[PDB]
């Protein structure tokens, strides 16, 4: 994977994460390799130095934004992000890096402890327990999103409402742009077939 391709995949993940209503798959290969590239370029005529530094800043910003985006999602849906990872089948791609997982567990422990000490333990006997998995909203997979097709895919399911007889299918042509519920095309975001914008 070329350094150029690396930055390209970084920006793709950055955009997908921005618009997807749920936390997407962890991309260790990208974060780590980009971090290295940034450190290797830290090992530093002047015009050439300025230009290199300028590109570094561009890459830095994208990585930082992407990472902040993922932390925001982790914090908003911490109980669901943890439950999904706990039940993930061995072998399936994870949506949490080791560090994000630790961070999420800590956010959970910190919040439960706070709620327990400040109010929960002071409530009637059978009202002291609050299931945060049920109290905290889950990611709304029905959210609408715009996308760009980078790899052709036929038979995308469109479900206007609750009545299945209204369902129909469409084809996603390379280079086309669409507006649709995220839920139906979710697996295409994961594989790279489409790009959220």
């Amino acid at each position: 994977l070329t350094p150029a391709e690396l930055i390209e995949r970084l920006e793709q993940a950055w955009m997908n994460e921005k618009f997807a209503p749920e936390l997407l798959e962890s991309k260790p290969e990208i974060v780590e390799c980009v971090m290295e590239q940034l450190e290797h370029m830290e090992e530093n005529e002047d015009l050439k130095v300025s230009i290199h530094q300028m590109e570094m800043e561009r890459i830095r910003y994208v990585l930082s934004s992407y990472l902040r985006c993922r932390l925001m999602k982790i914090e908003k849906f911490f109980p669901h992000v943890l439950e999904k990872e706990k039940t993930r089948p061995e072998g399936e791609p994870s949506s949490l890096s080791p560090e994000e997982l630790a961070f999420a567990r800590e956010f959970m422990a910190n919040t439960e402890s706070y709620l327990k000490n400040v109010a929960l333990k002071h409530m009637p006997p059978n009202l002291q327990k609050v299931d945060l998995f049920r109290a905290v909203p889950k990611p709304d997979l029905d959210s609408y999103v715009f996308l760009r097709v980078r790899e052709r895919q036929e038979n995308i399911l469109v479900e206007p409402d609750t009545d299945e007889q209204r369902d129909y299918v469409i084809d996603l042509e390379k280079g086309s742009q669409h507006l649709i519920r995220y839920k139906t095309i979710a697996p295409l975001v994961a594989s790279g077939a489409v790009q959220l914008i």
Binding site: L38, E75, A102, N110, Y114, V118, M123, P124, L127, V130
Partner: protein, 144 residues
């Protein structure tokens, strides 16, 4: 009747714009917890009169107090939770050290939650790369 005090907590917060953190309402919190205590006690005796007096005619009043208990609890948790969401924003907007005027409106337990969050975040960011990882609380805007 019941749960009016709990609503004061909610309104006070909802009126505070841009994540502003108003003073922790200790009295409101106390009074709600006290209302829940009373409600629980009255229901305990009534559920007893309905167990030793054939007062199944008290069930309506019983569920009534029960709904009020769940409501008081919902408001309490929502209030406290939202405040934590604003306190969390403080770390990103003002940094590791909070202005004392901002700390003044926080409860002792909230400062503790803040410090634990501060530490977890620092640890996370420190793990990103080789040397001191990466401070993602910086570079909030794209290069000029």
């Amino acid at each position: 009747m019941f749960c009016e005090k709990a609503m004061e907590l909610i309104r006070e917060l909802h009126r505070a714009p841009e994540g502003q953190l108003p003073a922790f309402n200790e009295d409101g919190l106390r009074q709600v917890l006290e209302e829940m205590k009373a409600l629980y006690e009255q229901n305990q005796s009534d559920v007893n009169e309905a167990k030793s007096g054939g007062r199944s005619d008290l069930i309506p009043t019983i569920k009534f107090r029960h709904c009020s208990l769940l409501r008081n609890r919902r408001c309490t948790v929502a209030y406290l939770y939202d405040r934590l969401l604003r306190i969390r924003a403080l770390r990103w907007e003002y940094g590791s050290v909070l202005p004392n005027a901002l700390r003044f409106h926080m409860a002792a337990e909230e400062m503790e939650w803040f410090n634990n969050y501060k530490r977890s975040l620092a640890t996370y960011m420190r793990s990103l790369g080789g040397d001191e990882g990466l401070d993602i609380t910086q570079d909030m805007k794209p290069p000029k």
